[PDB]
A paper describes a structure:
To provide a structural basis of how these two cofactors simultaneously interact with VCP and a framework for understanding this process, we determined the first structure of VCP in a ternary complex with VCPIP1 and p47 using cryo-EM. After initial rounds of 3D classification, we were again able to observe density in the two binding regions on VCP, similar to what we observed for the VCP-VCPIP1 complex (see “Methods” and Supplementary Figs. 6, 7 for details). We used a combination of symmetry expansion and focused refinement to zoom in on these regions. We obtained a 3.1 Å reconstruction revealing three VCPIDs bound at the C-terminal end of VCP without symmetry expansion, and a 4.0 Å reconstruction of the N-domain region with symmetry expansion. The binding mode of the three VCPIDs bound to the D2 dimer is indistinguishable from the binding mode observed in the VCP-VCPIP1 complex, with the stalk regions connected to each VCPID clearly visible. Since the interactions between VCP and the VCPID in all structures are unchanged, we conclude that p47 binding does not affect how VCPIP1 engages the D2 domains of the VCP hexamer. The p47 UBX domain competitively binds to the VCP N-domain, while not affecting VCPID binding. Taken together, the cryo-EM structure of VCP-VCPIP1-p47 complex reveals how VCP is able to engage with p47 and VCPIP1 simultaneously and maps key points of interaction between VCP and the two adapter proteins involved in mediating Golgi reassembly. Given that these interactions are maintained in the context of the VCP-VCPIP1-p47 complex we report here, we expect that they play a key role in ensuring efficient Syn5 deubiquitylation for membrane fusion.
The AAA+ ATPase valosin-containing protein (VCP)/p97, known as cdc48 in Saccharomyces cerevisiae, is an essential and highly conserved protein involved in numerous cellular functions, such as regulating protein homeostasis, endolysosomal trafficking, membrane remodeling, chromatin regulation, autophagy, Golgi formation, and others. Its core function is to unfold ubiquitylated proteins in an ATP dependent fashion. Previous studies have established that post-mitotic Golgi reassembly requires presence of VCP, as well as two adapter proteins, VCPIP138, and p4734,35. VCPIP1, also known as VCIP135, is part of the ovarian tumor protease (OTU) family of DUBs, an essential family of enzymes that remove ubiquitin tags from proteins to regulate protein homeostasis and function.
Author numbering:
A (entry chain H): 590 to 655
B (entry chain B): 199 to 430, 436 to 588, 591 to 718, 724 to 774
C (entry chain A): 199 to 429, 436 to 718, 724 to 774
Amino acid sequence: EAFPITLEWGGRVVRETVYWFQYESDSSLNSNVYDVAMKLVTKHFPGEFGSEILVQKVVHTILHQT
Amino acid sequence: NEVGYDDIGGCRKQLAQIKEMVELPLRHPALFKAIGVKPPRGILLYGPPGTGKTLIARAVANETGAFFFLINGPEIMSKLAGESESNLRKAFEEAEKNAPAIIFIDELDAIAPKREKTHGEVERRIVSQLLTLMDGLKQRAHVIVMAATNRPNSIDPALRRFGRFDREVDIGIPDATGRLEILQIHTKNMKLADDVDLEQVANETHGHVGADLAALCSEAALQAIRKKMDLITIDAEVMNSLAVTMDDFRWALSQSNPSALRETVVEVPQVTWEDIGGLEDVKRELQELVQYPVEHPDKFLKFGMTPSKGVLFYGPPGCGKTLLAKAIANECQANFISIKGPELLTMWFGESEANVREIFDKARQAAPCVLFFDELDSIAKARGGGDGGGAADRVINQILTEMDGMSTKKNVFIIGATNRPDIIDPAILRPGRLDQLIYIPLPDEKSRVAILKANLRKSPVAKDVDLEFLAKMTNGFSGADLTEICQRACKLAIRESIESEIRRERERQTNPSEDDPVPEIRRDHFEEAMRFARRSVSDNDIRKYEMFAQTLQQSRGFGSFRFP
Amino acid sequence: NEVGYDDIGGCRKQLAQIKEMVELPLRHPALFKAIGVKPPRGILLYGPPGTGKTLIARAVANETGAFFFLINGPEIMSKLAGESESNLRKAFEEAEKNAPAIIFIDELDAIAPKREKTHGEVERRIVSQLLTLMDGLKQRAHVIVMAATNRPNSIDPALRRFGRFDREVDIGIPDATGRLEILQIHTKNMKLADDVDLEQVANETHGHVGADLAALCSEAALQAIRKKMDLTIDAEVMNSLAVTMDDFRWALSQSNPSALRETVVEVPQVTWEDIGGLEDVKRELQELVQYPVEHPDKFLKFGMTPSKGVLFYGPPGCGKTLLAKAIANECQANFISIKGPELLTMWFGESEANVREIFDKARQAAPCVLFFDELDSIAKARGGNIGDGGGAADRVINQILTEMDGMSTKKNVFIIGATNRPDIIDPAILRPGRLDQLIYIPLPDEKSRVAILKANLRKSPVAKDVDLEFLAKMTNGFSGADLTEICQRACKLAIRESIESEIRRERERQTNPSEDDPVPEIRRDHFEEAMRFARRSVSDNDIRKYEMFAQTLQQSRGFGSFRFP
C-alpha cells in the first residue's frame, strides 16, 4: 500500500515512504493525492521557493503508483 | 423591379442595425439639426465575399428614397493614373447634387489595402484622395458612404479614423434560419415537388453563404432539366412542367464546395439544457454568471458587484463541457464562438499569437457572446505534461493580455475547458481572469438517459427499447461512449437492412414476379452494439478530478462563522 | 483544321464535366435565360502544363459552334503599357459581339500572378482591368470565359471570387487508359508494326502527359527513320518504315517525363484477389467506404454520420497499402497516397501549409480514399517514445487534424491511416470525429500467402510444375515483402542462368563455327535455391508488440452481457 517518493528540487535528495490508506469506510481517511504531496513537501522541504513544481511531480508520481 | 428588404435574407439582425443607423437620418434630415446630434459619415460592412452586402446597401437606399451611387474598387484602379482620382472625386461631387444619398464603395481593399501591401506611389495618392474626400464629407449635405471590405485588417487604418469609416457592421455568415430564408428567396420562381423541404437543406448546408446557396439551387434545377432533357423560347409546357425533387437537391448538395467552411461561425446554438439534462448545480452557476448580468443589470448596479469575466470547466474527456457551454449560450440567446485546441496549437507553432486580438474583437463585435476555449491545455501538453520552463507561453499570454483589456460593460464571457486542471497556467486562474473552476463529472443515470434520448432523436427507434435500462447498467460511461453505442447500433441496423435488400434482390432475380425488412433499430442491434461498448475513462482518471475537486474548492471552506 | 471531342483524349471525365457545364447553356441560349438560372460566368481549368487544355477549349467551342477567342498571357504582357488593356477590352467586346462565344485565356498566371509577384503599377492595373471585365459579363449574354493555370493558388485570389472565375475543373494527368487513348490518337497517322502493344507502352509510360507522349511517338518514328535513313516522301517507303516495339522501348528509355513529381490520382488497379485474406477487414472497409456511396438513403433513414476515416497498424510490409488500394478499387473511388517522406519534408521545411493543398485536392476528386502512408514518420523523427522532450502534437499532424475537422461528410472523402508504430501516434487523431477506428493488419496466413505469391508471379512466365500452394505452406510467417523477395530472387537466378547460357552458346559458336531456349521459364530449382536465400523480415517478438496492442484495446471492450429484459 506504501510506495517510495523522494523530493528532488534545487539539487537535493531525501528518503521517504508514502502511506496509502484508501478503502476506509468513512471515505474521509482515504488518502488524497494533493494533500499527501503538500504534506510531504512541507515536511521534507519546508518553506522552499517554487515548490509547486515539486508538488506537481509528487502528485504525478503518486497517481502513477496508484 | 427595385431591390428592397424582402429581397434580402440571412442578415435580419445586421439589416435592422443598418436601418436603425441610416434610415432615420436620411428619411428625416431636419430632426438631426434640431436635436443637434451627429449622424454617421461612413458605415463599413465586412464579411466573406458573396454575402450580398451590395444588395443590402441597394435595399437600404431604395427603401429610403435617396440616390444610390456604386463605386467598384477594381474599376477605379483599372483606370489610368489621374483618371482614377478624377472618377473618385466626381462620384462624391455628383452624389451631393442628388443628396441625401448613399455611396457604396465595393471592394474597398482594392482601393486602399493595408499599407504594407502597397508599393507604388500612385497607390498611396488614391488613398490620400479618398481620405481627403472623406474629411470633406463631414460637412456635406446628409451624404453617407457604405464601403464593403473582406475584414477590418484588409484596409489602411487611416480610413478607420473618426470622421471616416468609424461605424462597422459584421454581416457574417448566415445561420440555419438565414440559410432557409436565402433558399426561399432563390427558390421563389421555381417549381418543386412536395418531397422537397427547404428546412432540411438549410439545416444541412453548413459553411455556405448567400452566393453558394444560389449556386446550389441553380445546380439542382439544371440537374432536373438535364435528367429530363435527354428524354425530351423553350419546349413550352414540358419545361413549364419541370419539377425539382429532393433527390436533385441532395445531388447538387453533394456536388458543391462551400466557400466559407473555415470561417469562424457565430450564431446562437440550438442546444438546450435537456440535451444534457443534469448537473443542476452547474446549471445554476452558469445561470448566475451568464444570464443575470445580461438580464438584471439594475441589480448589479444597485449593489457594488461586478460581473465575473469567465469560468473554467475541467474533467474527464468528452463529458459535455461543449454541450453545457452551448446550452448556457442558448438559454440567454447569446452568440457562441468556439476555439478548438488545434487552432491554439496552430497559433503557437506559427507564432501567430497576434490573432488572439482578432478573436476577441470578433467576440466583442457580436455581444452578448459566450467565448468558449475548448482545450486551453493543448499547448501545455504539446510541450510535455515538460520542456523545462514555466507554464507561460505566447498564446496564453496573449489571451491574458486581451482578457485584461476587456471592458466589463460588454457582455462577452470566456469559458475555458481542459482535462488537466493542474497543468493549466496559474495566471489564467488569477482573480479577474477565469476566477472560477467548475468540475464537470461523469454523467449520472438520469443525465445518461437524457443524453441517450438526445442522441437517438434523429434515428427511428422501435418502441420496444427502453433507454432507462440501457442507462442503468452503463454506469461510468461518458457522453462519447454513449454516442458510440448509438452509432454502433445504427451501423448494425444499416448493415442488416443492406443485407436484407440484397437478399430481396436475389429473390427477385430467381423469381421475377414487398415491405421494409428492418424499418427500425431493433432491440437486438443495441444488444450486440453494447458488446463493443467500452468505458473510455478509467477510475484512475476519475481519481485525478475527484482529488482535485476535494482538495481545491474544499480545502479551507471552514465557514462555521456567525457575528455576535 | 477544326478540333472535336474525338481528337481529345486522357480527360474523359473532365471533358464530360465541361460538356455538361457549358454545352447546354451554349446550345440553347434563349431557353436558358427564360428559366431562372445563370450559366457559369467563368471556368478555370488547371493542371500541369502539356495536357492540351487549349485543345479542350477549342473542341468545346467547335462542337457547340460558339465563337472562340484565344488570349496569350505572355503575348498580352508583351505589349507596351496601355496597349495591353486596349487588347483585353477589344477581345471581350469581340467575344460579346459574336455571342454566344468562349474566351480562352491561356497562361492566366502570367497576366494575373499572385499579388506578391506583382510589383509594378501597370502589372496591377492589368489585373484590375481583367477583374472589371469579369464583373461586366453579367450584362453580356452567353459569354463563358475559361482560363488555364497550373494551380489555384498560382493566380490572384481576387479572380477566383464569385461572378468571376468560380468553376474549377482539375485536368490533372492522364491515367493508363488515358495514356492509351492519347497514344492511339497520336499514332493515328504513323505506320506501325504488329509487335507494338500500345497497352503495354501506356502501362510503362508513367508520369507522362499528352505532350510527353507525342514527343515519345515522334522519337520512335525518328529512330525508325534513322535505322532506315541510308536506304517528296514516297508513301510505300514510309509504309516500309514500320516502327517496332524495339523503337518504342528505345524512346521510353530516352524520354524524360515532365510530370513525375505530380500527385497521382486514379482508380487503383489492385483487387481483393491480390491479397485474399482478412475477410473481417474486407467487411469493415466495405461498410466504411462502399455503403455511404451506394446506400446514401440508409444513413438518412437511420440518421447516422458516416465515419470520416480509419487507422491501420501492423508489421511493416504486409498489405496496409494493398488493402487501401483494393477498397478504393471496389468503390471505383480515386486514390491518393501520401508517402512518409512527404510528411517528413513538410515537417523539416515547416511547410505544413501544404496539408491544406492535399486535402483540397482530395476533396476535389470526390469520392476518394485519402491514404497517409506513415502517420508515425514525423513522430519517429523526433525520437518517438524513445526520447521526446515535447509532446505528440506537431505541425503536420496538427494541420491534418484541423483539415479533417473542417471537412464536410457529404463529399465521401475517407481518410485512411497506416503505421508500423501505433503507440507513438498522436491521440488527437484517434478521437471521435476523426479516424476513430483501429484495425490490426496481421501477417498473411496460408491462403493469403498463396494469393500473394500468385499475384507476384502474374507477370513472370513461370513453369507449370511450380507448386505455389505448397510454397505457401512452408513459408509461414513471411510478409508480403518477403514473398515478393522470394519471387525476385527466383527471377534473378533464372535471368542470370539464361544470360550465362546465351554467353556459353556464343562461345560455342566462336570455338566451333558452323535454337531453343535453355531456360524458357522459372524452373523449380530456381525457387528452391532462392528459398535458401530468404529471411523473415518481422520476428515473432516484434509480432508480440502488435498482438499486445490489440489485446490491450480489446480488454477495454466489455459489457458483452447486455440482457435488457
